[PDB]
Design a protein around this ligand. Structure first.
Ligand code: HEM
Ligand code: HEM
Ligand code: HEM
Ligand code: HEM
Ligand SMILES: [Cu+2]
Ligand SMILES: [Cu+2]
Ligand SMILES: [Cu+2]
Ligand SMILES: [Cu+2]
Ligand SMILES: [Cu+2]
Ligand SMILES: [Cu+2]
Ligand SMILES: [Cu+2]
Ligand SMILES: [Cu+2]
Ligand SMILES: [Cu+2]
Ligand SMILES: [Cu+2]
Ligand SMILES: [Cu+2]
Ligand SMILES: [Cu+2]
Ligand SMILES: [Cu+2]
Ligand SMILES: [Cu+2]
Ligand SMILES: [Cu+2]
Lengths: 207, 204, 204, 203
């Protein structure tokens, strides 16, 4: 499981849920010969997280799909904004650099889905979910026929969540004044995803 | 290994090396009971055509993953760069399906463990220098070396001798060039600039 | 190992060596998760079979290559001529149909080759050997440059033969007269020619 | 899985089914200590996913006992193949290659020892192969019974199929025409059947 120093644990579960929804392209990781299998996959909630279900899909021709048959359990890694923290920002000495970042590791029991009806439901639900969340409210109606043409090439999976580790490493180990410097320094830069990161740092520091 | 459709393969090896250096906080992944171990770790080259090179890293001694690493002969390091959801609205085309444009590198290698304090000192100092030049502000650690020493007993390290590298540069290459131009433009007009640039680079 | 009834065993080891050389595109088979790995590969002897070495190559991008790391031992299956044998040919009753076929399973210790010089030697030797045996004596000099361009895409293996099972199921369970009927019937049809000759050799 | 470059994938599923029926003596391959088990077995059908392949083998074959510990197995079918010498290409530079046809079926393994089921399997194998000199087994049924206690069987429920139709598609159309004709001009089995398959792929 992911080791999270106590100071980097989320103050609210909403941080975890949001991070997952905001960054639904997870890394699906299962044991393999000599090292694990790892695939970037689009997941979404089925409808505190324990017992809920994450649905996902991937390429039928991806060898990971074949490997999934021998695995009872899996890990899904979600990552949000993150960035290097240069001590120059602290304006203090001595110091050490660090990396501020956000990530959620979901542990769960794995289930395989190959029924075309279930897969249609999944891919359509993914479009709706992403379009609302990360998207532009695109209408998929005129494309449903097209989806059918694609459907035999897709396979899916379900993960019933058994444990969740949440890492919100947002400079909380720093004094409030210094954290203020880190936030401002990230806000003064245009490079993504430091704007969003700065906002998360501020959120962790507020009341 | 990571399955990469031929069209999402890097046109140049420079893309891969660059992605690694720009996003050096990698995910270290090893086999574990029932499912894998995964830890976010700061990595750097020890200084593909990367096969045979060595990636060095460190982590918390008190992290259980460190205890798990003993007995792990091989490991995976996952690097991720810019990425974003791609809505069909941007395509201005029909019919369509949405997708995700993203950049990632999975390095496979043999794992070696480092617990000698001198080797750890070199690793952490080297990490500071490399990041300060690459992602940093050219910060000077001279006044903090003493502090590093107090931290040093709490850190452990690893080396991965690279045996294979998979590079995924999913940058809308499956679209028509006019459509790709629209995706680039949508990203440049949106609050995804580095990604738009990577897409344009694949498209040139 | 392959179970060979005593009557289907080769009368001379030359049958086995012959079969290997005549049909060098073998099936390389190693253990894998849930079921084995199997890839068709071009092999050749390195310059009774126990202790000798078989050399081969395959696609670097073939996932099987990744699996070969971590496999101490392997099986290579060579297949020569074979055919269904319908009881009509026997002109006897009662009977059961059968299949006459020729096969050699080589068991051996596996070693991986990724050195470019060694791979160059293997592929060139493969060309020489096949052109001499199964080819038209094509001259590769003008293509050596081209080979170099291909060379980064190829990986290789060596198997040190530890055991060999030889199946020459050629109707030896039949009366000599019946065997002649099978031979002649196979000779009248156009791999039944080569097969009829092997049956005859077993009967002679 | 069998790694199949896109250019060597079948244009029609009928190629895969045809190859299976024309070459029903498959290689049954399962995991074993240090390396796999491999046995040549006569199989027949009971796109391919969800279908069932039936087979039999010798009770005294140790592979049979090994089968009880295997959840899954691989069956390998091979059709015609031949070495391809660059001389036929009339091009330079070139590299030789091997043109071949193979189908690897992955599936869940089930064991059969019921005598009635074995009778059904062996008889069906006879009918199927005879049709695919149409020999009549009527007078030999009693004989089959004498043989029956010595045979054991298996079923594979197909979960995946890899199809390799390496038929010179990587060469130019003009070149493919040359390898086709060159293979047609030779009597060596099975270059005629192969030439026809290459032609079918070029169509
Ligand atoms: C709604 C209809 C959808 C259908 C019918 C569909 C179908 C497919 C198919 C056939 C593949 C196989 C390879 C390919 O064609 O790319 C695939 C893979 C993939 N799809 Fe979807 N998809 C849909 C929606 C989405 C959405 C909204 C996303 C959001 C990002 C997405 C992300 C992906 C990714 C990342 C892969 C690669 C999986 C792998 O690496 O194995 N898809 N999908
Ligand atoms: C660019 C510079 C650096 C970055 C980005 C960085 C990042 C990190 C990260 C992400 C971890 C957590 C690993 C885990 O989960 O187990 C960590 C742990 C640790 N590192 Fe570094 N680090 C840097 C420099 C240094 C230096 C110079 C030292 C000097 C000794 C050091 C000592 C430690 C120690 C003692 C721990 C474990 C205790 C703790 O987390 O505070 N690090 N580092
Ligand atoms: C008698 C001559 C040859 C035969 C019959 C032959 C056969 C084969 C076969 C069956 C494969 C597929 C292996 C797999 O599935 O992984 C392959 C792959 C490969 N071979 Fe050869 N080979 C020959 C000569 C050469 C030579 C001279 C080279 C020079 C470098 C070469 C380089 C390669 C490469 C780069 C691949 C990767 C995939 C491809 O391009 O086919 N081969 N060969
Ligand atoms: C007609 C009813 C059949 C019966 C009762 C029968 C029975 C048997 C028996 C008793 C064996 C044990 C070893 C032996 O005696 O050879 C065996 C194995 C075998 N049979 Fe059949 N058989 C029948 C049909 C066929 C057909 C049509 C074929 C087509 C080629 C065939 C091919 C084989 C092969 C290749 C083996 C060896 C399998 C191994 O290595 O374990 N049999 N069968
Ligand atoms: Cu754990
Ligand atoms: Cu793997
Ligand atoms: Cu490996
Ligand atoms: Cu867990
Ligand atoms: Cu792999
Ligand atoms: Cu674990
Ligand atoms: Cu668990
Ligand atoms: Cu690997
Ligand atoms: Cu399987
Ligand atoms: Cu496998
Ligand atoms: Cu052996
Ligand atoms: Cu496989
Ligand atoms: Cu064995
Ligand atoms: Cu052995
Ligand atoms: Cu399989």
């Amino acid at each position: 499981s992911m080791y999270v120093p106590e100071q980097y644990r989320p103050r609210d579960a909403s941080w975890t849920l949001e991070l997952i929804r905001s960054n639904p392209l997870a890394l699906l990781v299962t044991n393999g010969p000599q090292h694990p299998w790892a695939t970037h996959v689009p997941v979404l909630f089925a409808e505190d997280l324990v017992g809920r279900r994450l649905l996902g899909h991937l390429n039928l021709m991806n060898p990971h799909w074949e490997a999934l048959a021998g695995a009872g359990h899996a890990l899904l890694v979600f990552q949000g904004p993150g960035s290097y923290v240069s001590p120059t920002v602290y304006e203090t000495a001595p110091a050490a650099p660090t990396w501020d970042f956000t990530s959620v590791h979901v542990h769960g029991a794995l289930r395989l889905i190959d029924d075309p009806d279930d897969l249609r439901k999944i891919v359509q639900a993914t479009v709706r979910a992403y379009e609302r969340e990360v998207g532009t409210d695109w209408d998929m109606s005129e494309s449903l026929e097209y989806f059918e043409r694609l459907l035999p090439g897709v396979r899916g999976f379900e993960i019933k969540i058994e444990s969740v580790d949440s890492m919100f490493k947002l400079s909380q180990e720093q004094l409030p004044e210094t954290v203020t410097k880190v936030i401002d320094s990230f806000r003064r830069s245009d490079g993504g995803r430091r704007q969003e990161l700065a906002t998360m740092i501020e959120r962790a520091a507020s009341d």
